[PDB]
Amino acid sequence: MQIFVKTLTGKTITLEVEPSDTIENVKAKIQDKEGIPPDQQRLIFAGKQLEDGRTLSDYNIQKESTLHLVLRLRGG
Template identity: 35%
Template sequence: MASTASCLRVNVHYEKWEPMTFTANMEDRVKKISEHVRSKTKVPVQDQVLQLGSKTLKPHRKLSSYGIDKKTTIHLTLKVVKPSDEELPLVLVESGDEGQRHLLHVRRHSSVAQVKEMIESKTGVTPEKQIVTCNGKRLEDGNTMANYSIRRGTLLFLTYHCIGG
């Protein structure tokens, strides 16, 4: 059983909600605080950034690693990262015998047309000749990566329009 001497109070502040207070152990990881916040606010852990002053806390680190005094209350600030701002590193696989792979850095709000321009800069294939698919669906101009629920690390596949077959 942990002694009360190793416990501390954690206050988490966010502009849209009342402050949240939790009791934590000095050996708890920051991720545990994020899980408490998620249970109260429904904000997914991956969309949270917890800060102590100007320091951003890393989920895998223990509270004690930040030099927090166990006799005081720590005040953390919660920032919510909007999913539309998220960068999505994706792998593009070209059709053909070699199946060349290219890393693309897109954002959730990137349009398919913008992604096709990135593909052109990597492969030299013009957007008009590209057929880009993901999870069995053809990506259509006018949509964004978010429209297809594309996540970090997703594979995109590139094939080409054939003229005169």
């Protein structure tokens, strides 16, 4: 299976995973494929902010589940 990731500028990237792996694993993968450090990354799906320690399977993620990536200054 695979999932889709949305940035704030609308460009589309494609992944290649299974119903497994963790949020830190996928943020490291996005760092690898885009050069964005994990502290400069924020993930939103189903209108909520994701958790680093949790995995993708616990968030009920299926094939081509189009998630979104968010950039914050933090920024308070």
